[PDB]
């Protein structure tokens, strides 16, 4: 029945709040995980047959796909505590651009405005695990979800760099892209309503 | 010390007045200038403009001697005349909106950022929000405008909201503070940031 793509920037709790609400309406449900850099390329494939996509990546007029804001989540710009960016005030994007960025690569090679690397010096990886291993080791800087960097910010294994830019983290819209068939279904609007209502309350 | 500050017209009055309040507390001698969001960045990048700070919803990333940060958040609404085809039906995507005339803010430069560029291909450019809503009131198209510009007309039934299904409570929008490289070292500016941010969160 319902193929649902979830993106790895969506928090585990955010998934289970999405998971549960679907259980109340649908019986059969497939959950699929991708990088945020591959999420919108995945749904665009016809042969993938994906009904819903919950991701942070953004686009305007998509073929056969509606769009809505499901809620918000936080990302943090991070680096090793002894990395030169820490021992320094960080007022611009062009200050970060002097140093190397560890970004997610896509299978296509291109990125959206939101996910395109902001640096001249760039090193691509395929998941946030790989990204943070490099960053922990002192190689570059990266932007990653709160849940991926939470434990290490308490440990002092990483430092936050984005805190004068946007205190509390970099607020990020979580979109829901959905197949146009799902416009009508009362079960889907219920899903939307109860997903949102609960995602606010986290 | 002395400051010339730009604030765009998408920033609501209580947000403007809060920012005014803190600046006058931390600096002596402040000046204000108001512009369309679509002309805010092009204004501060002029030679003889001498604007030290710009508080605006428009985005650029790089391309300037100005530092960037996020001062706060603000809500916009997609609106239309209560009749008009878009109301007598549901509305899930850009495709539906792109079948009708957008009344967009136009820039004097000619260009637009990714944020402010019109989504439809049937488009009609105005120079401010007053003019946008005059055409929207009259039934000519749809537009996106701040809450405080449409608050009174929405409760009258003069306008209707087309964007509650897409983003309940309004389309959330970051308010950026662009600032002079000279200000980055000054304690008064950092105090200003801390105080304004906390007061803005309290609104
Ligand atoms: O790096 C990028 C492009 S890749 C990207 N990956 C993301 C992951 C997520 N997520 O996991 O939720 C969200 C957004 C992402 N964007 N943008 C970028 C945004 C803000 C910054 O903050 C600054 C800090 C100091 C001074 C100036 C700016 C720096 C860079
Ligand atoms: O039209 C634009 C670009 S121009 C623009 N002017 C702005 C003013 C403000 N402000 O005053 O605060 C803020 C953002 C602006 N962006 N974006 C756009 C955003 C969301 C929409 O919502 C939908 C509604 C129904 C179904 C699908 C989507 C539609 C269009």
Residue numbers in the entry:
A (entry chain B): 94 to 295
B (entry chain A): 93 to 295
What did the original publication write about this model?
To clarify how M64 interacts with MvfR, we solved the crystal structure of the MvfR ligand binding domain (LBD) complexed with M64 (MvfRM64) using the crystal soaking methodology under the conditions reported by Ilangovan et al.. The structure of MvfRM64 was determined in the orthorhombic space group C 2 2 21 at 2.65-Å resolution, with two protein monomers in the asymmetric unit. The model comprises residues Thr93 to Leu295. M64 was found to bind to the hydrophobic pocket where 2-nonyl-4-quinolone (NHQ), a congener of the MvfR native ligands PQS and HHQ, also binds. Although M64 has a higher molecular weight than native agonists, it is able to fit into the hydrophobic pocket owing to a bend at its central sulfur atom. The overall structure of a single domain of MvfRM64 was compared and found to be similar to the crystal structures of both the MvfR LBD complexed with NHQ (MvfRNHQ) and its ligand-free form (MvfRapo) determined by Ilangovan et al., suggesting that there is no major conformational change in MvfR when it is bound by M64 relative to when it is bound by a native ligand. However, a subtle local conformational change was found in the region of helices α2 and α3 (residues 181 to 191) adjacent to the binding pocket of MvfRM64. The Leu183 residue shifts down by 3.4 Å and rotates by 180° to make direct hydrophobic contact with M64. Given a distance of less than 3.5 Å between donor and acceptor atoms, a specific hydrogen bond with a 2.99-Å distance between M64 and an oxygen atom in the side chain of Gln194 was identified with well-defined electron density. In addition, PoseView analysis revealed that the phenoxy group of M64 forms a pi interaction with the side chain of Tyr258.
MvfR is a quorum sensing transcriptional regulator that regulates virulence functions critical for acute, persistent, and relapsing infections, making it a high-interest novel drug target for treatment of P. aeruginosa infections. MvfR belongs to the LysR-type transcriptional regulator (LTTR) family, which is widely conserved among prokaryotes. Two of the most abundant HAQs, namely, 4-hydroxy-2-heptylquinoline (HHQ) and 3,4-dihydroxy-2-heptylquinoline (Pseudomonas quinolone signal [PQS]), bind and activate MvfR in vivo, leading to the activation of MvfR-regulated virulence factors that promote infection. The MvfR LBD consists of two subdomains connected by an antiparallel β-sheet hinge region, with a hydrophobic ligand binding pocket between the two subdomains.
